[PDB]
Amino acid sequence: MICLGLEGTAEKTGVGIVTSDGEVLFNKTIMEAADHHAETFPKLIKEAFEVVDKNEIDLIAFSQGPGLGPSLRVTATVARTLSLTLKKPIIGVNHCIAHIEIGKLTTEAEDPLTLYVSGGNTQVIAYVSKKYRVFGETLDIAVGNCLDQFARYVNLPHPGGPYIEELARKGKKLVDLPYTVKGMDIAFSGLLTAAMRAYDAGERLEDICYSLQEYAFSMLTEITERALAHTNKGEVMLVGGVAANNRLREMLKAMCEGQNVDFYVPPKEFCGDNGAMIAWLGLLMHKTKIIPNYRTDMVEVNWIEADIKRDSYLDFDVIIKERVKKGYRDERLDENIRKSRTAREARYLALVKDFGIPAPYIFDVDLDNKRIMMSYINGKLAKDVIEDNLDIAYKIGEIVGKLHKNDVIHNDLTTSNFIFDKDLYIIDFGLGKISNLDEDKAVDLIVFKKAVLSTHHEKFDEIWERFLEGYKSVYDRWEIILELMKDVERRARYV
Amino acid sequence: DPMIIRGIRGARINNEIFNLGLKFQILNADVVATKKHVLHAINQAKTKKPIAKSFWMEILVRASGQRQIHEAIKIIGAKDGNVCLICEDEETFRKIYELIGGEIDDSVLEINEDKERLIREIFKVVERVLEKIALIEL
């Protein structure tokens, strides 16, 4: 039987009622203001009962998933009233997954790697292993939030989004801005201040807007490519508020076009966080209270790159890293990073030896072609060998402690970044400059922790300890940044 | 056809050898890692944006593992004792070999137990040298 859903996680107040088959009956949404929810809901829920008879509805759904504290409990109030005054069951739904489902329900998608980019949050989710798991994730603020915040700084009208896309389309100069990748995650608040200052500096607003996107969406489509492999899906869906963004739609397509994977976007009215959205999932789940940080990865479902060439140089078998150019990204930025990262994979995999930590010998640096000649150490990734040889987790912890002692901070620490011939050579350093800052060191740690939790959840426990076994050994200020690691981890949604 | 690269024991580095048409470079054999070191420097000089205005003087700076030219000569410039002569034609080699002294000795090119303190004292253990030359442009 058919079901009504209530949406009130953030700023939009959404009432919506959908059928068990898949047709929306009512779907209207009016835009600290929990009063807005506490006053809009009665109005919209009236207009709903003036479109569908109350008696014939069987289920009350309410987005109890990721969102603000007071905004949620208002929706929970209206939900708990409805359920007993109708004597119909209540169903607490996860807000993020709700976006994915009415994506599938509207688009001809079935099992997509979804980039959920909204003003509220931004992250890459794909159903893997009986749960919906988040891979890519913003470490600070949503692309919407970050973009909107810049608009308000420039004093552009309150749907900032459109006009920044507008002015972007008239830019000519790609301004230099902080591209930031922390393993699989992204940070935006750096890029935000950068654009904020670029504006004060004198650069054309028209320009600042273009590159801002160019940096935002390029680093967005970048992590999505990363997920596209790990999850190996045939389809790339785009839900969320900012899914509107023609340019982001453009490069997102372009990207999926290379790996021949499909690309869907839900028809306009089903990207904005809405009533019908969560209404579908509840009855879909059919076929208990708040949790402001609904860690998506905790649900029960019941609806079941740069290429290497091996070559011999002088008297050594070596490899050569051609940083293949990506067509999806701006021509000026595209080649700009692959030079920039080659200039650090060289500068670091070499400087790394200076404090006794194994990495391939670099025999040639070629920024013109973005290729780098380093000795071919015979591949046996630490990732693949960590089960039986748990002893390997020790030195990986060790050699990271060397780096943190010397202010050298890798930003993409993963078990597939190391191999085994005799020691643990890091066969990658592309991104990771030097930083004195204590918060940096702590951030890099959790980047690897998340990496092990990502691909090695099966035998994670007592091996993040085996990491520390080496990390405690080397770096002395180890309890210093791990205590601060707690401070930056408590960056969850506002309990 | 490779460069005539052979070490020489007993050297007589004088006024002469240079400004008479020496189209063939020679370094100080005490701080040449191996015959590979040179073979690297020549490849590096041969395929990177000319840091020196003649190929033969570039070999000096590449092998030096440093950008500066005057300071490059300070650390790898040929001197009395032993040297690593580089040439093209067998008798163009003979001309310079006649001017300086000593026997052709390839064993002075390679790293003794002695070099691997001094060589990496002034370079800051045998291939690491090549990577200093490799990063010479960052």
XYZ file of C-alpha atoms in Angstrom:
633
model
C 0.000 0.000 0.000
C 0.944 3.618 -0.747
C 3.029 5.871 1.539
C 3.696 9.498 2.539
C 7.151 10.788 3.487
C 8.408 13.839 5.382
C 11.682 15.571 4.495
C 13.327 17.997 6.921
C 17.064 17.364 7.345
C 18.360 20.798 6.301
C 16.710 23.868 4.708
C 14.053 22.417 2.407
C 10.761 21.283 3.962
C 9.489 18.431 1.803
C 6.150 16.653 1.902
C 5.636 13.829 -0.593
C 3.472 10.747 -1.128
C 4.309 7.923 -3.551
C 2.746 4.638 -4.685
C 4.065 1.146 -4.012
C 4.416 0.822 -7.806
C 6.497 3.967 -8.383
C 4.404 7.076 -9.088
C 4.568 10.326 -7.108
C 1.185 11.655 -5.975
C 2.282 14.761 -4.073
C 5.704 16.440 -4.143
C 6.084 20.010 -2.900
C 8.971 21.591 -1.000
C 9.257 25.085 0.555
C 12.651 26.733 1.135
C 19.205 27.969 12.717
C 15.590 27.817 11.432
C 13.718 24.728 12.669
C 10.674 27.009 12.974
C 10.663 26.943 9.182
C 10.076 23.204 9.374
C 7.688 23.655 12.315
C 5.537 26.062 10.260
C 5.915 24.804 6.683
C 5.005 21.180 7.426
C 1.362 21.902 8.423
C 0.854 23.997 5.262
C 2.381 21.426 2.887
C 0.767 18.501 4.672
C -2.589 20.261 4.224
C -2.026 20.717 0.464
C -1.109 17.021 0.434
C -4.399 15.890 2.002
C -6.156 18.123 -0.525
C -4.660 15.942 -3.272
C -4.898 12.460 -1.716
C -7.384 11.077 0.828
C -5.833 10.485 4.261
C -7.518 7.132 4.910
C -5.948 5.417 1.883
C -2.332 6.091 2.953
C -0.671 3.301 4.945
C 2.845 4.424 5.909
C 4.651 7.384 7.465
C 8.273 7.925 6.441
C 10.593 10.622 7.808
C 14.210 11.396 6.954
C 15.861 10.583 10.283
C 19.185 10.237 8.454
C 22.129 12.654 8.182
C 21.138 16.218 9.124
C 20.792 19.023 11.667
C 19.607 18.287 15.229
C 16.540 20.541 15.677
C 15.482 20.205 12.008
C 15.273 16.420 12.381
C 13.315 16.284 15.648
C 10.680 18.615 14.140
C 10.228 16.188 11.245
C 10.210 13.386 13.828
C 7.438 15.195 15.716
C 5.209 15.574 12.669
C 5.994 11.938 11.756
C 5.126 10.520 15.174
C 1.846 12.464 15.211
C 0.803 11.293 11.727
C 1.537 7.639 12.500
C -0.755 7.364 15.527
C -3.436 9.844 14.392
C -3.652 7.678 11.246
C -2.825 4.436 13.118
C -0.349 3.673 10.328
C 3.272 2.452 10.825
C 6.247 4.856 11.001
C 9.496 4.185 9.127
C 12.742 6.063 9.834
C 14.671 6.420 6.576
C 18.266 7.370 5.764
C 18.420 10.673 3.885
C 21.449 9.908 1.671
C 20.232 6.519 0.399
C 16.814 8.085 -0.260
C 18.533 10.251 -2.908
C 20.052 7.140 -4.521
C 16.747 5.246 -4.694
C 14.613 7.871 -6.479
C 17.607 8.187 -8.771
C 17.192 4.528 -9.700
C 13.406 4.978 -9.708
C 13.495 7.843 -12.219
C 16.653 7.225 -14.269
C 17.217 4.008 -16.195
C 19.930 3.159 -13.651
C 20.024 -0.018 -11.554
C 23.322 -0.301 -9.627
C 25.138 3.032 -9.853
C 28.192 4.582 -8.252
C 26.481 7.791 -7.143
C 28.109 11.142 -6.509
C 25.785 12.735 -3.968
C 26.686 16.414 -4.181
C 24.348 18.786 -2.331
C 24.626 22.067 -0.441
C 24.508 20.029 2.763
C 26.928 17.193 2.036
C 29.065 15.643 -0.679
C 30.296 12.062 -0.926
C 30.559 9.050 -3.257
C 28.266 6.133 -2.369
C 27.884 2.743 -4.048
C 26.157 -0.334 -2.636
C 28.966 -2.826 -2.009
C 28.655 -5.964 0.110
C 25.069 -5.860 1.482
C 25.546 -2.269 2.713
C 25.679 1.134 1.035
C 29.269 2.298 1.508
C 30.740 5.785 1.285
C 34.096 5.939 -0.507
C 34.875 9.508 -1.561
C 33.978 12.075 1.093
C 34.413 15.781 1.782
C 36.605 16.271 4.841
C 35.317 19.771 5.572
C 32.370 21.331 3.685
C 30.058 20.315 0.825
C 30.665 21.531 -2.745
C 27.336 23.344 -2.456
C 28.322 24.892 0.876
C 31.784 25.822 -0.406
C 30.441 27.310 -3.662
C 27.525 29.137 -1.969
C 29.845 30.524 0.714
C 32.021 32.130 -1.983
C 28.967 33.702 -3.645
C 27.847 35.297 -0.363
C 31.368 36.631 0.111
C 31.151 38.351 -3.304
C 27.575 39.462 -2.415
C 25.783 37.593 -5.192
C 22.059 36.657 -4.811
C 21.060 33.854 -2.453
C 20.874 31.010 -4.896
C 24.565 31.743 -5.535
C 25.115 28.577 -7.547
C 23.599 29.707 -10.881
C 25.431 33.047 -11.057
C 28.815 31.499 -10.278
C 28.120 29.065 -13.113
C 27.051 32.065 -15.209
C 30.141 34.185 -14.536
C 32.306 31.071 -14.927
C 31.047 30.656 -18.505
C 32.506 34.080 -19.276
C 35.942 33.544 -17.685
C 39.104 33.294 -19.787
C 41.943 32.893 -17.274
C 42.356 29.788 -15.114
C 43.570 31.192 -11.785
C 45.979 29.133 -9.613
C 43.990 27.520 -6.786
C 44.644 24.790 -4.203
C 43.748 21.421 -5.719
C 43.464 19.185 -2.654
C 43.259 15.382 -2.519
C 43.707 13.457 0.739
C 43.831 9.872 -0.501
C 40.268 9.251 -1.613
C 38.705 12.203 0.187
C 38.547 15.929 -0.714
C 38.937 19.236 1.106
C 37.170 22.390 -0.095
C 37.686 25.085 2.576
C 41.211 25.603 1.241
C 39.988 26.229 -2.296
C 37.283 28.472 -0.806
C 39.732 30.818 0.959
C 41.903 30.725 -2.149
C 39.053 31.922 -4.345
C 38.026 34.312 -1.540
C 41.481 35.877 -1.636
C 41.805 35.682 -5.457
C 38.756 37.951 -5.517
C 40.270 40.466 -3.109
C 43.484 40.256 -5.158
C 41.881 41.775 -8.275
C 41.388 38.812 -10.638
C 38.253 38.995 -12.821
C 35.200 37.721 -10.988
C 34.399 36.128 -14.331
C 37.768 34.366 -14.095
C 37.752 33.399 -10.377
C 34.382 31.710 -10.971
C 35.594 29.603 -13.917
C 38.650 28.117 -12.184
C 36.747 27.691 -8.910
C 34.479 25.187 -10.661
C 37.385 23.878 -12.710
C 39.128 22.984 -9.460
C 35.970 21.862 -7.612
C 34.468 19.640 -10.279
C 37.781 18.317 -11.586
C 38.600 17.110 -8.090
C 35.011 15.795 -7.915
C 35.176 13.789 -11.111
C 38.650 12.740 -10.032
C 37.520 10.795 -6.935
C 34.542 9.398 -8.871
C 36.998 7.859 -11.347
C 38.810 6.436 -8.302
C 35.592 4.848 -7.085
C 34.633 3.709 -10.619
C 37.438 1.132 -10.398
C 37.220 -0.014 -6.754
C 33.468 -0.592 -7.042
C 33.651 -1.484 -10.759
C 30.141 -0.303 -11.661
C 28.865 0.202 -15.208
C 26.937 3.369 -14.302
C 27.617 6.803 -12.806
C 24.590 8.534 -11.283
C 24.410 12.171 -10.099
C 21.922 13.051 -7.336
C 21.946 16.090 -5.070
C 21.153 19.798 -5.154
C 24.225 20.820 -7.155
C 23.523 18.111 -9.761
C 21.978 21.008 -11.683
C 25.439 22.332 -12.563
C 25.684 22.059 -16.359
C 29.502 22.145 -16.260
C 29.719 19.421 -13.605
C 27.253 17.427 -15.711
C 29.493 18.074 -18.710
C 32.785 16.824 -17.224
C 31.101 14.025 -15.275
C 29.867 12.686 -18.625
C 33.180 13.265 -20.345
C 34.867 11.182 -17.610
C 32.479 8.223 -17.785
C 32.837 8.453 -21.584
C 36.441 7.220 -21.442
C 35.785 4.062 -19.422
C 32.632 3.537 -21.525
C 30.455 3.592 -18.371
C 26.955 5.084 -18.367
C 25.934 8.417 -16.769
C 22.467 9.286 -15.457
C 20.945 12.320 -13.765
C 17.465 12.163 -12.100
C 14.830 14.468 -13.729
C 15.028 17.959 -12.192
C 12.539 17.678 -9.304
C 14.308 14.634 -7.722
C 17.785 15.920 -6.866
C 16.657 18.559 -4.410
C 16.168 16.922 -1.032
C 12.445 16.194 -1.125
C 9.342 14.555 0.375
C 8.643 11.877 -2.239
C 12.338 10.993 -2.179
C 12.283 9.469 1.314
C 8.646 8.323 0.916
C 9.683 5.815 -1.745
C 12.530 4.259 0.289
C 10.307 3.570 3.342
C 7.764 1.581 1.331
C 10.634 0.128 -0.716
C 12.079 -1.089 2.582
C 8.605 -2.416 3.472
C 8.470 -4.650 0.380
C 12.852 4.535 16.748
C 14.251 8.097 16.542
C 16.915 10.676 15.498
C 20.519 10.071 14.408
C 21.991 13.379 13.073
C 24.944 11.461 11.662
C 23.342 8.413 10.050
C 26.504 6.651 8.939
C 24.991 5.303 5.671
C 27.349 2.293 5.825
C 25.078 1.075 8.675
C 21.890 -0.020 6.875
C 20.245 -3.335 6.037
C 19.338 -3.653 2.381
C 16.645 -5.990 1.144
C 16.442 -4.951 -2.483
C 19.290 -7.104 -3.780
C 45.252 6.586 -13.074
C 48.468 6.768 -15.118
C 49.920 3.823 -17.056
C 53.307 2.098 -16.582
C 55.686 0.659 -19.167
C 58.420 -1.810 -18.224
C 61.743 -1.012 -19.900
C 65.460 -1.522 -19.332
C 67.557 1.615 -18.862
C 71.290 1.276 -18.273
C 71.835 -2.069 -16.599
C 68.489 -2.109 -14.809
C 64.972 -3.227 -15.584
C 62.928 -0.098 -14.871
C 59.427 1.359 -15.289
C 58.188 4.663 -16.734
C 55.123 6.504 -15.358
C 53.224 8.249 -18.170
C 50.760 10.493 -16.320
C 48.000 9.984 -18.886
C 46.063 13.187 -19.536
C 42.373 13.266 -18.704
C 40.022 14.743 -21.301
C 37.257 15.551 -18.822
C 39.311 18.303 -17.135
C 40.306 21.810 -18.286
C 43.230 21.757 -20.746
C 45.285 24.234 -18.716
C 44.645 22.430 -15.415
C 44.888 18.892 -16.897
C 48.561 19.055 -17.807
C 49.181 21.436 -14.906
C 48.700 18.793 -12.187
C 50.386 15.875 -13.983
C 53.500 18.030 -14.211
C 52.999 19.218 -10.622
C 52.667 15.695 -9.241
C 55.554 14.311 -11.329
C 57.685 17.085 -9.851
C 56.913 15.673 -6.401
C 56.912 11.962 -7.067
C 60.501 12.626 -8.163
C 61.378 15.157 -5.447
C 60.051 12.927 -2.674
C 60.717 9.282 -3.630
C 64.299 10.576 -3.698
C 64.339 12.836 -0.612
C 62.770 9.882 1.194
C 66.090 8.006 1.082
C 67.724 10.838 3.105
C 66.091 9.483 6.287
C 66.510 5.798 5.459
C 63.273 4.647 3.841
C 63.181 2.506 0.662
C 61.796 3.806 -2.652
C 62.751 3.082 -6.299
C 65.759 4.877 -7.774
C 64.586 7.611 -10.135
C 66.878 7.662 -13.164
C 65.005 10.282 -15.234
C 62.485 13.095 -14.699
C 60.617 14.315 -17.786
C 58.073 17.033 -16.927
C 57.593 17.759 -20.643
C 56.000 14.338 -21.137
C 55.089 13.882 -17.463
C 56.929 10.561 -17.408
C 59.401 9.359 -14.794
C 61.954 6.552 -14.985
C 62.249 4.574 -11.770
C 63.768 1.150 -11.152
C 61.332 -1.737 -11.565
C 61.010 -3.371 -8.184
C 59.109 -6.647 -8.697
C 55.488 -6.057 -7.635
C 54.135 -7.712 -4.480
C 51.797 -5.042 -3.062
C 51.677 -4.780 0.741
C 47.885 -4.849 0.241
C 47.950 -8.377 -1.200
C 50.525 -9.734 1.260
C 49.261 -8.297 4.561
C 47.081 -11.314 5.490
C 49.644 -14.140 5.825
C 52.573 -11.767 6.359
C 51.035 -9.535 9.034
C 54.627 -8.612 9.926
C 54.552 -6.189 6.970
C 52.181 -3.828 8.845
C 55.088 -3.084 11.200
C 57.501 -1.358 8.783
C 54.714 0.596 7.024
C 54.003 2.155 10.418
C 57.744 2.639 10.900
C 58.501 4.408 7.614
C 55.542 6.776 8.039
C 57.055 7.822 11.397
C 60.259 8.774 9.584
C 58.262 11.135 7.367
C 56.358 12.727 10.256
C 59.647 13.332 12.055
C 60.957 15.213 8.997
C 57.736 17.182 8.219
C 57.308 15.224 4.983
C 53.635 14.417 4.569
C 52.330 11.985 1.955
C 48.623 12.499 1.348
C 47.662 9.193 -0.274
C 48.723 6.474 2.147
C 47.386 3.064 1.071
C 48.539 -0.576 1.287
C 48.740 -0.638 -2.535
C 51.326 2.172 -2.371
C 53.923 -0.291 -1.027
C 55.483 -3.482 -2.446
C 57.760 -6.286 -1.240
C 61.090 -7.485 -2.646
C 62.903 -7.464 0.697
C 61.931 -4.170 2.363
C 58.845 -1.960 1.970
C 59.456 0.378 -0.944
C 56.813 3.076 -1.507
C 56.197 3.009 -5.257
C 54.174 6.265 -5.139
C 54.450 9.805 -3.714
C 52.758 11.953 -6.427
C 50.938 14.283 -4.034
C 52.360 15.260 -0.669
C 54.342 18.425 0.012
C 56.157 19.342 3.260
C 54.244 20.840 6.221
C 55.307 21.776 9.762
C 51.669 21.872 10.914
C 50.601 19.370 13.573
C 47.036 18.932 12.228
C 48.484 17.807 8.874
C 50.283 14.845 10.435
C 47.074 13.755 12.206
C 45.015 14.031 8.993
C 47.400 11.758 7.064
C 47.107 9.083 9.771
C 43.296 8.824 9.556
C 43.644 8.835 5.762
C 45.423 5.468 5.993
C 43.156 4.251 8.827
C 40.165 4.873 6.568
C 42.090 3.164 3.746
C 42.531 -0.027 5.804
C 38.930 0.187 7.021
C 37.980 0.566 3.335
C 39.692 -2.437 1.720
C 40.785 -4.504 4.754
C 37.810 -4.428 7.163
C 37.973 -8.244 7.261
C 41.202 -8.193 9.318
C 41.563 -4.514 10.337
C 41.558 -4.983 14.108
C 44.941 -5.676 15.729
C 46.681 -4.380 12.548
C 46.098 -0.633 12.969
C 47.879 -1.523 16.219
C 50.597 -3.337 14.220
C 50.879 -0.097 12.247
C 51.416 1.882 15.468
C 53.836 -0.837 16.612
C 56.150 0.641 13.999
C 54.879 4.235 14.197
C 55.286 4.485 17.974
C 58.802 3.074 17.466
C 60.034 5.801 15.135
C 58.307 9.151 15.733
C 58.559 10.520 19.291
C 55.747 13.102 19.094
C 53.422 10.188 18.276
C 51.012 10.644 21.228
C 51.086 14.346 20.355
C 49.360 14.089 16.936
C 47.250 11.011 17.815
C 45.659 12.957 20.680
C 44.957 15.760 18.195
C 43.697 13.037 15.820
C 40.799 12.637 18.281
C 40.093 16.389 18.052
C 39.834 16.330 14.241
C 37.857 13.061 14.232
C 35.197 14.729 16.393
C 34.269 16.676 13.250
C 31.149 14.515 12.921
C 27.646 15.936 12.540
C 26.574 17.952 15.561
C 25.464 15.113 17.942
C 79.216 3.627 -31.011
C 79.976 4.551 -27.366
C 82.129 7.367 -25.951
C 85.740 6.385 -25.332
C 85.430 6.382 -21.553
C 88.548 5.092 -19.808
C 90.149 6.010 -16.470
C 93.787 7.120 -16.374
C 96.296 6.738 -13.526
C 99.024 9.364 -13.163
C 97.657 12.628 -14.552
C 99.327 15.783 -15.846
C 96.505 18.333 -16.014
C 98.136 21.386 -17.583
C 97.507 24.694 -19.324
C 97.638 22.779 -22.630
C 94.922 20.158 -23.177
C 91.947 22.578 -23.294
C 92.099 25.604 -25.650
C 93.696 23.793 -28.608
C 90.584 22.073 -29.994
C 89.813 19.620 -27.176
C 86.462 18.377 -28.509
C 86.547 15.779 -25.699
C 85.882 16.198 -21.956
C 87.655 14.719 -18.880
C 86.622 14.632 -15.183
C 88.270 13.826 -11.818
C 88.328 10.041 -11.375
C 88.304 10.224 -7.555
C 84.635 11.278 -7.496
C 83.294 9.349 -10.508
C 80.930 6.655 -9.139
C 81.481 4.034 -11.873
C 81.683 3.961 -15.665
C 77.888 4.054 -15.275
C 78.023 7.478 -13.546
C 79.555 8.958 -16.715
C 77.299 6.936 -19.027
C 74.446 8.549 -17.076
C 75.801 12.113 -17.099
C 76.352 11.839 -20.892
C 72.779 10.654 -21.372
C 71.529 13.386 -19.062
C 73.542 16.072 -20.857
C 72.382 14.586 -24.162
C 68.624 14.669 -23.474
C 67.926 17.593 -21.091
C 67.578 21.376 -21.610
C 71.216 22.472 -22.053
C 72.416 23.721 -18.659
C 75.840 24.360 -20.247
C 76.415 25.943 -23.663
C 78.620 23.136 -24.953
C 77.824 19.405 -24.703
C 81.314 18.572 -23.395
C 81.187 21.115 -20.575
C 77.668 19.953 -19.739
C 78.907 16.448 -18.955
C 80.923 18.187 -16.196
C 77.874 19.866 -14.619
C 75.557 16.851 -15.007
C 78.098 14.485 -13.456
C 78.650 17.180 -10.818
C 75.100 16.548 -9.595
C 74.658 20.329 -9.237
C 73.342 23.216 -11.351
C 76.180 25.743 -10.791
C 79.068 25.462 -13.297
C 81.918 27.057 -11.341
C 81.054 25.057 -8.233
C 80.677 21.967 -10.464
C 84.338 22.225 -11.465
C 85.134 22.654 -7.761
C 83.906 19.124 -7.037
C 84.323 17.040 -10.227
C 86.744 19.061 -12.397
C 89.770 17.111 -13.625
C 92.942 17.431 -11.520
C 96.488 16.041 -11.092
C 96.443 12.355 -10.137
C 93.683 10.373 -11.871
C 91.059 11.293 -14.461
C 88.218 9.860 -16.620
C 88.880 10.896 -20.218
C 85.954 11.048 -22.658
C 86.476 11.162 -26.445
C 84.960 10.170 -29.811
C 87.815 9.005 -32.068
C 90.599 6.668 -30.886
C 93.456 9.015 -31.867
C 91.694 12.193 -30.753
C 91.933 10.362 -27.415
C 95.630 9.633 -28.076
C 96.405 13.359 -28.454
C 95.181 14.251 -24.947
C 96.504 11.006 -23.442
C 99.905 12.071 -24.812
C 99.654 15.508 -23.151
C 98.712 14.197 -19.682
C 100.519 11.139 -18.265
C 100.059 7.672 -16.783
C 98.482 4.370 -17.791
C 94.947 3.780 -18.982
C 93.368 2.259 -15.849
C 89.592 1.608 -15.698
C 89.910 0.483 -12.072
C 90.329 4.080 -10.851
C 86.828 4.869 -12.151
C 85.110 2.459 -9.766
C 84.231 3.126 -6.148
C 86.817 1.872 -3.657
C 85.914 1.255 -0.039
C 87.499 4.746 0.179
C 85.149 6.643 -2.147
C 81.904 5.492 -0.487
C 82.631 7.887 2.410
C 84.177 10.796 0.516
C 82.024 10.497 -2.617
C 78.791 10.642 -0.614
C 80.226 13.193 1.809
C 80.406 15.666 -1.051
C 77.253 14.276 -2.696
C 75.287 14.076 0.586
C 75.542 4.138 -2.349
C 76.524 4.026 -6.059
C 73.184 4.581 -7.817
C 72.075 7.246 -5.376
C 74.634 9.404 -7.236
C 72.628 8.946 -10.476
C 69.439 10.169 -8.769
C 71.209 13.347 -7.632
C 72.001 13.845 -11.333
C 68.395 12.958 -12.195
C 66.870 15.571 -9.880
C 69.354 18.202 -11.103
C 66.327 20.001 -12.597
C 63.902 20.518 -9.687
